[PDB]
């Protein structure tokens, strides 16, 4: 197949001759014909529109290799790629029994108009019904459902081949698996209801290892305008959590802390907490502590912004909100600057802001302590990021000293 695709310019005639002779020749033609005719899915009716005549030989060869050697992942990947490419091409370019069925169910211009409108641009059902009613003036639904699936069979083969190929890697490069996962996700997103009959059972049996590299995509694709796709994605993520919780642990708790982006996260955290509740509680506590360990800096920034924008009610509202939000380190700050609220209230009816800003700037110019800003030991939480780690390393303790990097956006 590779050598054939290489010299396609000088081999485009033999393939067409083989196709023509198949429905009615050098040594290569007869040899290929005999190879295809070897007894053990693809139909010529579907590839009869928008598909090149010599390109069918490649698909036939891929199918034969896949059925003859089901233990090799190369054949399945090649067949899936070919089917996906031609399926997308025919779908983009498309935007005997049917005519007889329509004529029998509708017992010359009207028939032609109805036939043309049946597949003019195939909420779709409502639009089709309205167009048919407005043109002709009920078996139209069945005819439309059958005709749309007839010209939509390559995608089914591509999805089945990709699923089978992934099932064998539970032997190929990681790039090939990532490509298959991306294609499957794109198909499930673009055309969901048109091929939902395959994803329903396909996503319920695939392993978790090949889907370990597209977690962010799955999380970001949790707001699709549907209900079954969201449930399927949630179930797949929950299954992936088992035997590998160090993958969707941090993003789930981060997202949890529209209702579409809430129910899925709640279900994921609930399923992940049924095994190690202590780990979930510990990760939530550490996340909360980290978020709350980001007071003096906020006050200094607010004072600087107010002083810069001074040259009314907005300043008073901002000061009140900051004081209300600010109510080891918090106690010291409150005891050292407890007159800020009183000074602001007295000046409301302006040197207090300037004095506070000057004091904060003078005191700004680094070494901190963990106990002052709690301290766990022998924890079992995974490290923040273990994509490449055969044996997940659990956090033992936290450094008692935290520094700040100068000449930057105040990083810690």
End-to-end CA distance of the chain: 57
| CA 370 – CA 352 distance, rounded (Å) | 32
| CA 305 – CA 169 distance, rounded (Å) | 57
What letters, b where the CB count within 10 A reaches 16 and e where it falls short, cover 198-231? bbeebbeebebebbbebeeebbebbeeeeeebbe
232 within 8 A of 200, measured Cβ to Cβ: yes
234 within 8 A of 267, measured Cβ to Cβ: yes
138 within 8 A of 106, measured Cβ to Cβ: no
* DSSP bridge pairs for 394: 382
CB atoms < 10 A from the CB of 1, how many? 13
| CA 32 – CA 27 distance, rounded (Å) | 9
Give the method of determination: cryo-EM
DSSP annotation string for 369-397: ESTT-----S--PBPS--SS-SSPPBP--
Annotated resolution, angstroms? 3.6
Instruction: Determine the length of the chain.
Output: 412
Which tokens is 177 given? 């698996």
| CA 319 – CA 331 distance, rounded (Å) | 19
117 within 8 A of 135, measured Cβ to Cβ: yes
Measured between alpha carbons, how far is residue 85 from residues 26, 80, 155, 275, 386 in Å? 30, 9, 9, 43, 35
Which tokens is 341 given? 């609220």
| CA 375 – CA 98 distance, rounded (Å) | 73
| CA 407 – CA 363 distance, rounded (Å) | 17
* DSSP bridge pairs for 401: 369
Spatial CB neighbours of 133, under 8 Å, sequence gap ≥ 6: none
Give the three-state DSSP class for 328.
coil
Q: What is the dihedral of CA 87, 89, 93, 96, to 10 degrees?
A: -30
Exposed/middle/buried for 181, CB within 10 Å: 0-12, 13-18, 19+? buried
203 within 8 A of 167, measured Cβ to Cβ: no
Element holding 50 (H helix, E strand): none
Give the three-state DSSP class for 402.
strand
| CA 409 – CA 405 distance, rounded (Å) | 9
Which tokens is 123 given? 């909420």
295 within 8 A of 397, measured Cβ to Cβ: no
Give the three-state DSSP class for 245.
coil
| CA 62 – CA 39 distance, rounded (Å) | 15
* DSSP bridge pairs for 369: 401
246 within 8 A of 275, measured Cβ to Cβ: no
| CA 205 – CA 239 distance, rounded (Å) | 10
* DSSP bridge pairs for 402: 368
Characterize the bridge pairing of strands 368-369 and 401-402. Answer: antiparallel
Which tokens is 121 given? 């641009």
Backbone angles phi, psi at 369, to 5 degrees: -130, 140
Helix axis angle, 296-310 to 313-325, nearest 10°: 180
Which tokens is 325 given? 């939000």
CB atoms < 10 A from the CB of 332, how many? 11
Spatial CB neighbours of 399, under 8 Å, sequence gap ≥ 6: 370
What value, to the nearest 5°, has the Cα angle with vertex 109 and ends 107 and 114? 65
295 within 8 A of 363, measured Cβ to Cβ: no
| CA 223 – CA 234 distance, rounded (Å) | 11
| CA 73 – CA 174 distance, rounded (Å) | 13
Helix axis angle, 277-292 to 249-256, nearest 10°: 60
Helix axis angle, 154-167 to 174-190, nearest 10°: 140
DSSP annotation string for 164-212: HHHHTT----HHHHHHHHHHHHHHHHHSSTTSHHHHHHHTTT--SSTTS
| CA 202 – CA 371 distance, rounded (Å) | 51
Element holding 368 (H helix, E strand): strand 368-369
Element holding 133 (H helix, E strand): helix 124-136
Which tokens is 104 given? 């029998």
| CA 225 – CA 272 distance, rounded (Å) | 25
Q: What is the dihedral of CA 297, 303, 304, 305, to 10 degrees?
A: 110
| CA 274 – CA 380 distance, rounded (Å) | 15
352 within 8 A of 343, measured Cβ to Cβ: yes
Exposed/middle/buried for 185, CB within 10 Å: 0-12, 13-18, 19+? middle
């Amino acid at each position: 197949a590779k050598w054939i695709q290489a010299e396609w310019k000088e081999i485009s005639g033999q393939l067409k001759q083989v196709y023509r002779a198949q429905h009615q020749l050098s040594t290569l033609s007869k040899n290929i014909l005999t190879l295809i005719e070897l007894p053990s899915i693809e139909s010529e009716s579907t590839v009869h529109i928008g598909v090149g005549e010599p390109d069918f030989i490649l698909g036939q060869l891929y199918h034969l290799s896949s059925v003859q050697a089901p233990e090799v992942a190369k054949s399945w990947a090649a067949l899936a790629s070919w089917a996906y490419r031609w399926g997308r091409k025919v779908v983009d370019n498309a935007s005997x029994x049917x005519x007889x069925x329509x004529x029998x169910x509708x017992x010359x211009x009207x028939x032609x108009x109805x036939x043309x409108x049946x597949x003019x641009x195939x909420x779709x059902x409502x639009x089709x019904x309205x167009x048919x009613x407005x043109x002709x003036x009920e078996g139209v639904i069945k005819v439309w459902r059958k005709v749309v699936d007839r010209i939509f069979s390559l995608y089914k083969l591509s999805c089945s081949a990709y699923f089978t190929f992934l099932k064998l890697n539970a032997q190929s490069t990681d790039d090939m698996i990532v490509m298959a996962t991306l294609r499957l996700l794109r198909l499930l997103v673009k055309h969901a209801g048109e091929l939902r009959q395959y994803l329903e059972h396909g996503l319920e049996t695939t392993p978790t290892a090949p889907w370990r590299g597209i977690i962010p995509q799955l999380f970001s694709r949790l707001n699709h305008p549907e209900v079954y796709v969201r449930q399927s994605i949630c179930n797949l993520l929950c299954r992936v959590a088992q035997d590998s919780p160090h993958l969707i642990l941090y993003p789930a708790i981060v997202g949890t802390i529209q209702a579409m982006m809430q129910d899925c996260y709640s279900k994921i955290v609930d399923k992940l907490s049924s095994a190690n509740p202590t780990m979930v509680l510990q990760v939530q506590m550490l996340v909360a502590e980290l978020r709350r360990v980001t007071w003096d800096e906020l006050w200094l920034g607010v004072l600087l912004q107010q002083h810069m924008y001074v040259l009314x009610x907005x300043x008073x509202x901002x000061x009140x909100x900051x004081x209300x939000x600010x109510x080891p380190h918090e106690k010291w700050f409150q005891d050292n600057y407890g007159d800020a609220i009183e000074n602001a209230l007295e000046k409301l009816k302006x040197x207090x802001x300037x004095x506070x800003x000057x004091x904060x700037x003078x005191x700004x110019x680094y070494i901190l302590r963990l106990e002052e800003i709690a301290a766990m030991t022998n924890t079992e939480i995974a490290l923040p990021g273990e994509v490449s780690a055969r044996d997940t390393v659990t956090i033992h303790s936290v450094g008692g000293t935290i520094t700040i990097l100068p000449t930057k956006t105040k990083p810690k």
